[PDB]
């Protein structure tokens, strides 16, 4: 099967429950795109098609979440052989009440890949807890990935503000208005995280 | 230093040494192997992390990195078990449960055994689990509850028929919530795959 | 299949010409050690056990090369999969006269993982053509790999001392008396390159 | 644009030690054009332009070395995701004392992609050790790649012949009259060597 027809083939073996067969055409994947490449071209569009059959009601949840986890195992492996270097680290989560992780975990890989010490605590983290670690590592920068709305609407005005030197907010359910209502950095763009540190 | 192994993990995780933590981990592979590793050192430096957040002596986002880590260890060895052809056993946990290990391991543990479990992350509503399930013929369902409110949640029967043979365990459940809620109790992974090829 | 066989099978899959087989066994000893951990418990014993056993004339060449090239393709692939940082690089090479890469692609990979811009140029760099272009990219240190002692004996005295700001030598080859003749900081283990920079 | 206009700005990432735009370039001309395409008229271009540039004096060693190497990587990731079929090997090297590999590889890649189980053994391979591995996993052929005269004119007449059943030697350093004297069947097109195997298909 020819590039362009890998996401139709990683979606279908999914759906089927054919784990093998999505991880070698992950892998595949991988070694066309690059790990960059596969991210964009492969993980991300699978991922809302994934969503968007959901929406039309052609699948469940327990679809979506067999498809995330996969997604998320791939971008663990490749988060994993990058590296982590030495120094202040940037702690990246998900707002309070957000479990999406695909999000934080490419702003994480983004990082990593250009040499930054991107923590990945993992999801849904309360704000003086994230704070407090931010604190006491000497984080140079949070990092908050939102895909929905509803977790930042949660949130009171300035709750951002100061929970480490830098915080960015972004994801399609952040904005620049809600950025600056909660005290954070919005960017639209992972490849600009790593140039603003 | 396998005596020492844990403690020296903890340690790393909480100061944010991911490359020390990953050393420590690949060092208790080589002592212990894949399944001595997870009673070695996965699970007791993950309940350590719990009682030191109930103890109140880290927050959440020091927990939270440490379990990441520890997922993505058994993520690794749940993918070396390998995944057989045939009709799949599909290993979740509850609606309202978040906590991923317990799952994990049981997939773990059928997929040491040439069971093909699905592991599908956590929480994962009923209805869309029985359709799931339906649609990948699926011959058994697995549940691991750590805590047991999202279960006493559940009405009764819930589980009954998400596959035709549906496994409850976790320290969350007891053999009582499972029969009320339509589900085979079981405490051994190490048996969970023969219970499932056998008879009721 | 068991992580303590995997070198066996791994060597005996080379030997045998089954380049799929190995493939399938180096991934599954990095998806168990991580990117260093392989190295150290796969790649390293099984490139170990080629080299002696062609020292003991049980192998030919051409099955020492086709077990040396797999592995070299395996490093380069995790090599290319590492951060690579903004900033001036770090230039990895061997002496000339040296035409094993191994040692200097290790060292490259562990200092990429340390975020560290290493730059392997492949082996076997003249010194003057070496420090043009450390001098003309800002690098801020030289690495060289030296796993035979001659290329090494047969430099003049201070050959390494000017190459960049700071100059490394290890592997078998080098020892620090060695290293001081030729100018150069010694270093046993590549563990501690990334900190001594 | 032709992939060949991408050669500049590949190469000059590749100078001032850029390697994530190198990449990131090579990666585009792959999207874009394909394997194929991208090996033909932008690899190769910008690695004869290299050495010829190395050749002026207009570059030095460590540049030269830089690019090669990103450019080996490159193919060697391609030759990788060809696969590597079941079934008799076909063996892939050069000749003793060519330490050149890029035909080499590419000669592999261009039989992997045909189904053929090319085996890159690496370069510079001393022929009675190819032969041994030849017999012993049953190689239906071997192929040898020459950038340089100079070792296949070391080479006794004959030498070639008996490598295995078939016997291939393509690359500027060799020609027909040479390849004769050696016994070995000259070939210069890759993309015609799986079918010279005479296979199903
Ligand atoms: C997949 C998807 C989901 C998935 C989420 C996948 C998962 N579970 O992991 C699921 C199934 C959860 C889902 C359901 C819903 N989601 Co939805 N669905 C989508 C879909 C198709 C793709 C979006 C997506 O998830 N992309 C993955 C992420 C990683 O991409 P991203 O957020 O755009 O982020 C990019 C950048 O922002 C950047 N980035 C990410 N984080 C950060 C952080 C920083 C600092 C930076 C710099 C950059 C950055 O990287 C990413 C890729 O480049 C879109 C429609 C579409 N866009 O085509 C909606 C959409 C986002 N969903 C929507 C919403 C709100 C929902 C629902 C509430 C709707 C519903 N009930 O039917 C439910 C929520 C239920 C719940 N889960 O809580 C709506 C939002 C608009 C609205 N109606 O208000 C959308 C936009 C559909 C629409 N057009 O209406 N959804
Ligand atoms: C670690 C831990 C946490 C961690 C969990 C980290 C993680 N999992 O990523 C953190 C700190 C997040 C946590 C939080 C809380 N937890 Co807590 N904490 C624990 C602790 C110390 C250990 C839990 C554990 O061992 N998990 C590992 C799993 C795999 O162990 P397991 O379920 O026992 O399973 C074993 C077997 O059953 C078998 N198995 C597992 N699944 C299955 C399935 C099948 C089919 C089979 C056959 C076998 C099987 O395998 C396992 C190993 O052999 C215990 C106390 C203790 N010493 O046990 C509590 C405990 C579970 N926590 C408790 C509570 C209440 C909480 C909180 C609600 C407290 C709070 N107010 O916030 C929160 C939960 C909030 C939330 N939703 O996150 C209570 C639960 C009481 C109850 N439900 O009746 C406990 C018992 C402590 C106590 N005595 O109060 N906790
Ligand atoms: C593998 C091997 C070969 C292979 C190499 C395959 C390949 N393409 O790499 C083959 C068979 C080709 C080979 C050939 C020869 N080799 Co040989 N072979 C070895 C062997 C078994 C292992 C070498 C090795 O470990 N390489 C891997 C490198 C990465 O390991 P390393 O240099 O030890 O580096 C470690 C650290 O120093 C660190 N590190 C590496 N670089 C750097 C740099 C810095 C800055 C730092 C901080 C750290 C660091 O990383 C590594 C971690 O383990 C050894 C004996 C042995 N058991 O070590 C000999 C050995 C190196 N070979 C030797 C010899 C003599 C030869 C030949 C000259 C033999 C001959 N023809 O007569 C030829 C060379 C000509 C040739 N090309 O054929 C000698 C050299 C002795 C000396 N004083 O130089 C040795 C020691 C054997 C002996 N005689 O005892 N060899
Ligand atoms: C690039 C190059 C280099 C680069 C090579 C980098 C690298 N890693 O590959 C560098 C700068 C390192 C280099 C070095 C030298 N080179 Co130079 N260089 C060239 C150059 C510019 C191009 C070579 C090339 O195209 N290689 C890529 C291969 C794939 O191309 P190809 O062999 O033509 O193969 C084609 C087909 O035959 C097919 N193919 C290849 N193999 C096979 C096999 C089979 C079976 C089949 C079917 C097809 C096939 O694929 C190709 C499609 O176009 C040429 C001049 C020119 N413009 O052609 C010289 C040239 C080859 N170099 C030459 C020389 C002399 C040298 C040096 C000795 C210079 C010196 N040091 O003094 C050194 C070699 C040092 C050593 N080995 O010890 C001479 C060789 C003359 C001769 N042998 O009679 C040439 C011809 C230049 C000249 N006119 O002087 N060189």
Redesign the interface.
């Given at each position: 099967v020819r590039?362009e027809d890998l996401g139709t083939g990683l979606l279908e073996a999914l759906?089927?429950?054919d784990?093998?067969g999505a991880?070698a055409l992950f892998r595949?994947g991988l070694?066309?795109?690059?790990?960059?490449?596969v991210l964009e071209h492969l993980l991300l569009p699978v991922l809302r098609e994934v969503g968007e059959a959901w929406h039309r009601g052609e699948i469940?949840?327990?679809?979506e979440?067999?498809a995330?986890?996969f997604l998320?195992?791939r971008l663990?492996?490749?988060l994993?052989?990058?590296?982590?270097?030495?120094?202040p680290?940037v702690?990246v989560?998900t707002p309070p009440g957000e479990?999406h992780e695909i999000g934080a975990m490419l702003a994480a890989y983004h990082l990593?890949?250009?040499?930054?010490?991107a923590?990945?605590?993992?999801p849904?983290?309360?704000l003086?807890?994230?704070r407090?670690?931010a604190r006491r590592?000497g984080a140079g920068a949070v990092v908050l990935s939102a895909v929905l709305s509803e977790p930042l609407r949660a949130l009171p005005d300035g709750a951002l503000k100061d929970l480490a030197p830098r915080v960015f907010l972004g994801g399609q359910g952040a904005g620049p208005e809600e950025a600056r209502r909660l005290g954070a950095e919005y960017m639209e763009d992972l490849k600009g995280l790593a140039e603003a540190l």
């Open positions: 590039p759906l089927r429950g784990l093998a991880e595949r070694r066309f795109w690059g790990p960059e490449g469940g949840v327990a679809e979440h067999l995330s986890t998320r195992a663990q492996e490749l994993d052989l990058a590296g982590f270097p030495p120094g680290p702690l989560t479990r990593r890949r250009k040499g930054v010490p923590l990945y605590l993992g849904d983290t309360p003086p807890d994230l407090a670690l590592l």
